[PDB]
Amino acid sequence: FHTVDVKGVQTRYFDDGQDKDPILLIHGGHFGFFIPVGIESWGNVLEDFGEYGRVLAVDKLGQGETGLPLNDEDWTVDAVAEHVANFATQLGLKNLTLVGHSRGGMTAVLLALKYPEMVKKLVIISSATAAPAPPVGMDFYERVERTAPSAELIRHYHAAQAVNEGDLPEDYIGIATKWLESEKQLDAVAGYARNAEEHWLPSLSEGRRWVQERLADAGIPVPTLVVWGVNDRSAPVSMGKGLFDLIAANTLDSSLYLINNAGHHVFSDQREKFNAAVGAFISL
Amino acid sequence: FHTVDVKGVQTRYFDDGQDKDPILLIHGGHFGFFIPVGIESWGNVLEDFGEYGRVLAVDKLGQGETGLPLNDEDWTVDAVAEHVANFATQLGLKNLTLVGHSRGGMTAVLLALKYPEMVKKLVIISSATAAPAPPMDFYERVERTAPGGSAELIRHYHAAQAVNEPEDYIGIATKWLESEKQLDAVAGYARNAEEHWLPSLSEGRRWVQERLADAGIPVPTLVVWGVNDRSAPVSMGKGLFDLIAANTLDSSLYLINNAGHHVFSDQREKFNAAVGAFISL
Numbered sequence: 001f002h003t004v005d006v007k008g009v010q011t012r013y014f015d016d017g018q019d020k021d022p023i024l025l026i027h028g029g030h031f032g033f034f035i036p037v038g039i040e041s042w043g044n045v046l047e048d049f050g051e052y053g054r055v056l057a058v059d060k061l062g063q064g065e066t067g068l069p070l071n072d073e074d075w076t077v078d079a080v081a082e083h084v085a086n087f088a089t090q091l092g093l094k095n096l097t098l099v100g101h102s103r104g105g106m107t108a109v110l111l112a113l114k115y116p117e118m119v120k121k122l123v124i125i126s127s128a129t130a131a132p133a134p135p136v137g138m139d140f141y142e143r144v145e146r147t148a149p150s151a152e153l154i155r156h157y158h159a160a161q162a163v164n165e166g167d168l169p170e171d172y173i174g175i176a177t178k179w180l181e182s183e184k185q186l187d188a189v190a191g192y193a194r195n196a197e198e199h200w201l202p203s204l205s206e207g208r209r210w211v212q213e214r215l216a217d218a219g220i221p222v223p224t225l226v227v228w229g230v231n232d233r234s235a236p237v238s239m240g241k242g243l244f245d246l247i248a249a250n251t252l253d254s255s256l257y258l259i260n261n262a263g264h265h266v267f268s269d270q271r272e273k274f275n276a277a278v279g280a281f282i283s284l
Numbered sequence: 285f286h287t288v289d290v291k292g293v294q295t296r297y298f299d300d301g302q303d304k305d306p307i308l309l310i311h312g313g314h315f316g317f318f319i320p321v322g323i324e325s326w327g328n329v330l331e332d333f334g335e336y337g338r339v340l341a342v343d344k345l346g347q348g349e350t351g352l353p354l355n356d357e358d359w360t361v362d363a364v365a366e367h368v369a370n371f372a373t374q375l376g377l378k379n380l381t382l383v384g385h386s387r388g389g390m391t392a393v394l395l396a397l398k399y400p401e402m403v404k405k406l407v408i409i410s411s412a413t414a415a416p417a418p419p420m421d422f423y424e425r426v427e428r429t430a431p432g433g434s435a436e437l438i439r440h441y442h443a444a445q446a447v448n449e450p451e452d453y454i455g456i457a458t459k460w461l462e463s464e465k466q467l468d469a470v471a472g473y474a475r476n477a478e479e480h481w482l483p484s485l486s487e488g489r490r491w492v493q494e495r496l497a498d499a500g501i502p503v504p505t506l507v508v509w510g511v512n513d514r515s516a517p518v519s520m521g522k523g524l525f526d527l528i529a530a531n532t533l534d535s536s537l538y539l540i541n542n543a544g545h546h547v548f549s550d551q552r553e554k555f556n557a558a559v560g561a562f563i564s565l
Contacts, residue, residue, distance in 0.1 A: 280557040
């Protein structure tokens, strides 16, 4: 991988680096989250999407191997999105296809809404931040954290959310274990404990309100695909269908793809289907 | 463009014809429907799918230029599906990708459930027949609010259906609308609907649902729907996909926004991209 200084934040990323239009992958999780998330969490997609463009993937602010925010005020969704935007600008990325999984999706949306000039296409995978609440379901992550005996924790989480499950390669287990036991993770947990109530959570609620407000106005200004696994255990499909209902309201160029026998990690559960559909979408 | 006899029935079909695995397109509507439907209604699809395989298409029983059912007891859904099946047997199609639209979808589904050995995979487009029952009738309303005719009827119908914007189809449908076969078909429907065809719909639906709740569809399935379908609401599509997903692991749903009942016409590029992707798996 590579490292670049983004506004004083040391930032790790992956680059193809083919002579094609860029595809930017934005992973899930958040700074201080009990499961460490990074570029390697994309597993095979890093390689596979090489068929459809110049793949890049960045560790988000305070995750993977990129440094934590330099300000308490930067423990916000806007600061994460801004970090990704500044990152893309530093590399001179132009005809960008944004691909966002889970919270990354949120990040992705926020970019597509705020910087249309930079974005050509938007792909949203299992992002429930702006999604309408289910009728009744939603304590998945608390349960997963509770039922864990740490490599064991990572293995356990993966097994917990998988539907067409496979076992994680030992290399990824090693990398993520290193993340989980790193000083930066400890600092990230302390930082979340310090800045959650004052900065992160309110920015989350306001982010949801503003996104939904935009979807009910002019909608997303770029072509948008929503991908969801039918058997998602942490982000129920109902939320995906509701989200897409919110999106189709004023975004004419939008689509919804639901894959059966797939969990929160759709790309991991139904690799071939995912690659085919999303690749076809990116390719037009 | 081609003609062949099927069980004593003059049947017209289209062939690509390439050295590729077959793709059988099944159009919608039914015999005696006030709007005549045929192969031409597939428009660009007929050519566009030449990339994903050997495209074949066929006018269903008592539609297009194919003949009417031989007896009145053959005005059933099963008769239509069996007609297409015997057509396939006579042509000997193996590794077959079935693509059905509207009522055609229903046909395809039956073919997928009765003859899995023949079918490689299934695509269902805007077929509400096997869908869960929803909570004035659209087509009756369209016919009621139409002017004469008959070009104005076809244009009124397509206007009533279109959301986001084939010449061959318009011309030929105008010609069919004033043909004798269409008259005979309307009379035949008027005669055999209440006794045969509608019960055939009820039973067909019941058996298909019951089959989905058992072992599900035996082949990989894609459901395609237009969000702004006037004739068959998206809720029916999502319901049908629920029923399918219950026991069909390899199943998928694709919802295209800014698209109505004729999805392939309203959003050609997206449709071709997704369905083509599915077929190339």
